[PDB]
């Protein structure tokens, strides 16, 4: 029943910080771990105890451990306004970073710390009276996030066979990009993670950039900005596991509702309404309007056009103040008005769920304490645009095998590229076959 989250690399760790902050603000948990309602210094049975394990002092410690081959970030964790929440054993800090090198994270510096990482997963996997599975955060470009994540997934389908494991990834935006070899890692950490993953959402940082610059009016978005957005995006896909909800309550249920085939487990996610805390502030939006915004590329998380593309599965999670029959009406209007072409062998009906609680946000944050909100989880073939903007940013470089010698120098054969390319070509091919 209880799930365990895990954070890899700079991006992963920061994202984790924000996400657990939001979880606490929604449940009503204080920064030192307490809760007004609660259940007498440790009950372990509530809806929100699928993620929190309570202590004799009533300290709702999150079921999570943090990892970085670089202490600079996780130290910002044990120094932040929440230094009293976790336990230092949930914080693993290496020495030399992977330096944006996948081979340094899987092979060299990874093997020198994986045993301690498993060692720290264990103590919190024992308190699991019934373990559903894992949730993992990382990046596509960063060295730690690309390498050590693949190492942990390999050594996670081992030590825990198959229960469930769900992924969250950060797609490279040449905007806030810092490395030239961000495609390389990004491809490898996919070729060596496609199988161990049950489900996997993506995040095009270029889309988060486009959205904070279009709908939030931050000309120069810093990292804390983009992250503050991606948190409130995630906390709607996962709000169903922490509360007594209707849809998406098991980790494998995602594989059911969203995944018809395990190779293709990359759902386009879309969140509405994205509105600033000082912007517009006119009349609030209806349910039909936020449902309509679920099909605008300006609100999709990956820069892709689902128009010129087929759908496969499509869910919609609502929260706030929503009426059922209203949602039904919007569903019909979209079903008829659009050319939303679904492939033939899938249930084109749209499963939906609600949580009757106000979507709390960061007090004083860059977003609005909105009233009603919707998040579409639609796996679509058009997401195959994303890989095309990497393989093209890949074949230009493997056709001059530049920057390759660094991987060779840190323990990896040149044939791992020759197989990691063909693998991706195969996945893209599958994304073509689903349509015709």
């Amino acid at each position: 029943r209880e799930c365990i989250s895990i954070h890899v690399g700079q991006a992963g760790v920061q994202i984790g910080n924000a996400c657990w902050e939001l979880y606490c603000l929604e449940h009503g948990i204080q920064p030192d771990g307490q809760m007004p309602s609660d259940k007498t210094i440790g009950g372990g049975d509530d809806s929100f105890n699928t993620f929190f394990s309570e202590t004799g002092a009533g300290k709702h410690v999150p079921r999570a451990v943090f990892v970085d081959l670089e202490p600079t970030v996780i130290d910002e964790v044990r120094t932040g306004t929440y230094r009293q929440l976790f336990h230092p054993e949930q914080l693993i800090t290496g020495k030399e970073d992977a330096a944006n090198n996948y081979a340094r994270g899987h092979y060299t510096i990874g093997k020198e710390i994986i045993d301690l990482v498993l060692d720290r997963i264990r103590k919190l996997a024992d308190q699991c009276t019934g373990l559903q599975g894992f949730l993992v955060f990382h990046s596509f470009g960063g060295g730690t996030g690309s390498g050590f994540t693949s190492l942990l997934m390999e050594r996670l389908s081992v030590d825990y066979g198959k229960k469930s494991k769900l992924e969250f990834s950060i797609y490279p935006a040449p905007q806030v990009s810092t490395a030239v070899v961000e495609p390389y890692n990004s491809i490898l950490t996919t070729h060596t993670t496609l199988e161990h993953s049950d489900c996997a959402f993506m995040v095009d940082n270029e889309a988060i950039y486009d959205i904070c610059r279009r709908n939030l009016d931050i000309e120069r978005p810093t990292y804390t900005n983009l992250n503050r957005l991606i948190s409130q995006i995630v906390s709607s896909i996962t709000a169903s596991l922490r509360f007594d909800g209707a849809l998406n309550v098991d980790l494998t249920e995602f594989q059911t509702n969203l995944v018809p085939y395990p190779r293709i487990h990359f759902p386009l996610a879309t969140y509405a309404p994205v509105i600033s805390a000082e912007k517009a502030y006119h009349e609030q939006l209806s349910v039909a309007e936020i449902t309509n915004a679920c099909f605008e590329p300006a609100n999709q998380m990956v820069k892709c056009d689902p128009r010129h593309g087929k759908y496969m599965a499509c869910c919609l999670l609502y929260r706030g103040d929503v009426v059922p029959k209203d949602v039904n009406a919007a569903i019909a209007t979209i079903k008829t008005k659009r050319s939303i072409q679904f492939v033939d062998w899938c249930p084109t009906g749209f499963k939906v769920g609600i949580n009757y609680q106000p979507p709390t946000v960061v007090p004083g944050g860059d977003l609005a304490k909105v009233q009603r909100a919707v998040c579409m989880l639609s796996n679509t073939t058009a997401i195959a645009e994303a890989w095309a903007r990497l393989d093209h940013k890949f074949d230009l470089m493997y056709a001059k095998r530049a920057f390759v010698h660094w991987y060779v120098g840190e323990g990896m054969e040149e044939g791992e590229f020759s197989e990691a390319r063909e693998d991706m070509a195969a996945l893209e091919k599958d994304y073509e076959e689903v349509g015709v």
Partner: protein, 431 residues
């Protein structure tokens, strides 16, 4: 990733090293005694990179001064900041060098290198997480080039899990201390190719150009060039010396700027071209900065980039300015001359911004470039060299010190090969 251990060798290398420590010591806010007096915290966010932390609120340059001349260290100590250096980090011999590489790398130099290594190890044991080693030397002399390459070999073999970084300076026929500068340079390059991860090529001839023509200094003294060197070095190390995601450490910067094992020879670029102690009647804009720092007149190597295509570029703007203006102007420079950039490396032109500008300058633009134009340097040497190596002239001054005639042909060949490599990767396409 944290500390950088610094070394300077030879007459030139020790002079320009002294000036560099003056520069960054003034930027971060350090006095000739060693106390901190600055008025900004950003100066001390990453101060350990180039400074040992000593008791008494002091700061000691984690540096190591090496020569075989006696008098150079004398010119250091009685120099301005000569009080701050931990005296045990002075290491120097009494023989000299005579602008003789072989002397520096096999004989009189080899009788001091272990003693250098013990001080290096004393600074590396008090380290926590050592990044790599930054080196400055002359390539036309005997001390810095020979003993320098020796040190590079033994240090990169003692810790091969760290970074090796060099700031080498060229022989100039327009300066010319001797007439075996081509030989010294040739061998030193032969080492630097297989030994170092990064090499910032300062061309002495190019600096004579920028002094005599752009700055109009008709009799360029050595310090005149050492100002341009000091500015260049202060600029390129901005990424390492201040908070910045881009090029945070040596390994990152090297991985972003080096796509091929051998080719790690960078053309630096500074703007605006500033004399010593001169006023700025109208400090440059942002378009003027970006326009000059890619222009050939601002290049530290005596080469034309209008002849060679960049593989990667690390641009650094110092001084507060409009970031949007920066991004736009950089896009301008990139896609107006896209027939001068490789397209098979996407987004290869990275850019970081600093806030504390250089000394006196309101805004500056520091540019690092992995260019296939740098071969115009090598092909100079590899010609200068060949002209003398054909009838084996001046060979007795090295073979007489105990070398092998084949050690030269391995060098000339390896260099002609590096040039063929550069042209090879220049003629690259998108097929």
């Amino acid at each position: 990733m944290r500390e950088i251990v610094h070394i300077q060798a030879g007459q030139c290398g020790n002079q320009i090293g002294a000036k560099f420590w003056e520069v960054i010591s003034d930027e971060h806010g350090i006095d000739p005694t060693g106390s901190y007096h600055g008025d900004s915290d950003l100066q001390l966010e990453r101060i350990n990179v180039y400074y040992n932390e000593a008791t008494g609120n002091k700061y000691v340059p984690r540096a190591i001064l090496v020569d075989l001349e006696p008098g150079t260290m004398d010119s250091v100590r009685s120099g301005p900041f000569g009080q701050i250096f931990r005296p045990d980090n002075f290491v120097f011999g009494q023989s000299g060098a005579g602008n003789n590489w072989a002397k520096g790398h096999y004989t009189e130099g080899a009788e001091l290198v272990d003693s250098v290594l013990d001080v290096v190890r004393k600074e590396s044991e008090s380290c926590d997480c050592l990044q790599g080693f930054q080196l400055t030397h002359s390539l036309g002399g005997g001390t810095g080039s020979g003993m320098g390459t020796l040190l590079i070999s033994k240090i990169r073999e003692e810790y091969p899990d760290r970074i090796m970084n060099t700031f080498s300076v060229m022989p100039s026929p327009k300066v010319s201390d001797t007439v075996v500068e081509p030989y010294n340079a040739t061998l030193s390059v032969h080492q630097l190719v297989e030994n170092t991860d990064e090499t910032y090529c300062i061309d002495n001839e190019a600096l004579y150009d920028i002094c005599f023509r752009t700055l109009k200094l008709t009799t360029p003294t050595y310090g005149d060039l050492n100002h341009l060197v000091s500015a260049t070095m202060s600029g390129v190390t901005t990424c390492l010396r201040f908070p910045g995601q881009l090029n945070a450490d040596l390994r990152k910067l090297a991985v972003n700027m080096v796509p091929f094992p051998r080719l790690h020879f960078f053309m630096p670029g500074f703007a605006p071209l500033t004399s010593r102690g001169s006023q700025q009647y109208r400090a440059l804009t942002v378009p003027e900065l970006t326009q000059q720092m890619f222009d050939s007149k601002n290049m530290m190597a005596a080469c034309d980039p209008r002849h060679g295509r960049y593989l990667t570029v690390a641009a650094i703007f110092r001084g507060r300015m409009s970031m949007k203006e920066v991004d736009e102007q950089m896009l301008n420079v990139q896609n107006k001359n896209s027939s001068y950039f490789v397209e098979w490396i996407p987004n290869n032109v990275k850019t970081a911004v600093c806030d504390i500008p250089p000394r006196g300058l309101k805004m500056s633009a520091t540019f690092i470039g992995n260019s296939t134009a740098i071969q115009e340097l090598f092909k100079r040497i590899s010609e200068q060299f060949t002209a003398m190596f054909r009838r084996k002239a001046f060979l007795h001054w090295y073979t007489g010190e105990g070398m092998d005639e084949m050690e030269f042909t391995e060098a000339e060949s390896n260099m002609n090969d590096l040039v063929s490599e550069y042209q090879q990767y220049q003629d690259a396409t998108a097929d």
